[PDB]
Coordinates of all heavy atoms in Angstrom, one line a residue:
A30 N -165.0 63.7 -13.2 CA -164.7 62.3 -13.7 C -163.4 62.2 -14.5 O -162.7 61.2 -14.3 CB -165.9 61.8 -14.6
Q34 N -160.3 59.8 -13.3 CA -159.8 58.7 -14.2 C -158.3 58.8 -14.4 O -157.6 57.9 -14.1 CB -160.5 58.9 -15.7 CG -160.1 57.8 -16.6 CD -160.8 57.9 -18.0 OE1 -161.0 59.1 -18.6 NE2 -161.2 56.7 -18.5
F49 N -159.9 52.4 -15.6 CA -161.3 52.6 -15.3 C -161.8 53.5 -16.5 O -161.1 54.3 -17.0 CB -161.6 53.3 -14.0 CG -161.3 52.4 -12.9 CD1 -160.4 52.7 -11.9 CD2 -162.0 51.1 -12.7 CE1 -160.0 52.0 -10.8 CE2 -161.7 50.3 -11.6 CZ -160.8 50.8 -10.7
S50 N -163.1 53.2 -16.9 CA -163.7 54.0 -17.9 C -164.2 55.4 -17.2 O -164.3 55.4 -16.0 CB -164.9 53.3 -18.5 OG -165.9 53.1 -17.5
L51 N -164.4 56.4 -18.1 CA -164.9 57.7 -17.6 C -166.2 57.4 -16.8 O -166.4 58.0 -15.8 CB -165.1 58.6 -18.7 CG -165.5 60.0 -18.4 CD1 -164.4 60.8 -17.6 CD2 -165.8 60.8 -19.8
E52 N -167.1 56.6 -17.3 CA -168.4 56.5 -16.8 C -168.3 55.8 -15.4 O -169.0 56.2 -14.5 CB -169.3 55.6 -17.7 CG -170.7 55.3 -17.2 CD -171.5 56.6 -17.0 OE1 -171.3 57.6 -17.8 OE2 -172.3 56.7 -16.1
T53 N -167.4 54.8 -15.2 CA -167.1 54.3 -13.9 C -166.7 55.3 -12.9 O -167.1 55.3 -11.8 CB -166.1 53.1 -14.0 OG1 -166.7 52.0 -14.9 CG2 -166.0 52.5 -12.7
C54 N -165.8 56.2 -13.3 CA -165.3 57.1 -12.5 C -166.4 58.1 -12.1 O -166.5 58.7 -11.0 CB -164.1 57.9 -13.1 SG -162.6 56.9 -13.3
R55 N -167.3 58.4 -13.0 CA -168.4 59.3 -12.9 C -169.3 58.8 -11.7 O -169.8 59.6 -11.0 CB -169.1 59.6 -14.1 CG -170.3 60.7 -14.0 CD -169.7 62.1 -13.7 NE -170.6 63.1 -13.3 CZ -171.3 63.2 -12.0 NH1 -171.1 62.3 -11.2 NH2 -172.2 64.2 -11.9
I56 N -169.6 57.5 -11.7 CA -170.6 57.0 -10.7 C -169.8 56.8 -9.3 O -170.5 56.9 -8.3 CB -171.1 55.6 -11.0 CG1 -170.0 54.6 -11.5 CG2 -172.1 55.8 -12.3 CD1 -170.6 53.3 -11.7
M57 N -168.4 56.6 -9.4 CA -167.6 56.7 -8.2 C -168.0 58.0 -7.5 O -168.1 58.1 -6.3 CB -166.3 56.5 -8.5 CG -165.8 55.2 -8.8 SD -164.1 55.2 -9.2 CE -163.7 53.8 -10.2
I58 N -168.0 59.0 -8.3 CA -168.1 60.4 -7.7 C -169.5 60.6 -7.2 O -169.8 61.1 -6.3 CB -167.8 61.5 -8.9 CG1 -166.3 61.6 -9.0 CG2 -168.4 62.8 -8.5 CD1 -165.9 62.5 -10.2
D136 N -163.2 46.7 -14.7 CA -163.9 48.1 -14.7 C -165.2 47.9 -14.4 O -165.8 48.6 -13.6 CB -163.7 48.7 -16.1 CG -164.5 50.0 -16.1 OD1 -164.3 50.9 -15.2 OD2 -165.2 50.2 -17.1
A140 N -167.8 49.0 -11.3 CA -168.9 49.8 -11.5 C -170.1 49.2 -10.8 O -171.0 49.9 -10.3 CB -169.2 50.0 -13.0
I177 N -177.4 58.5 -9.6 CA -176.2 57.4 -9.7 C -175.8 57.2 -11.1 O -174.6 57.8 -11.4 CB -176.6 56.2 -8.9 CG1 -177.1 56.5 -7.5 CG2 -175.5 55.3 -8.9 CD1 -176.0 57.3 -6.7

Side-chain angles (χ1 to χ4, degrees):
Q34 177 176 47
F49 288 122
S50 63
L51 182 65
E52 186 56 36
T53 298
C54 295
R55 184 67 186 73
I56 56 176
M57 280 178 208
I58 286 174
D136 177 52
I177 306 304

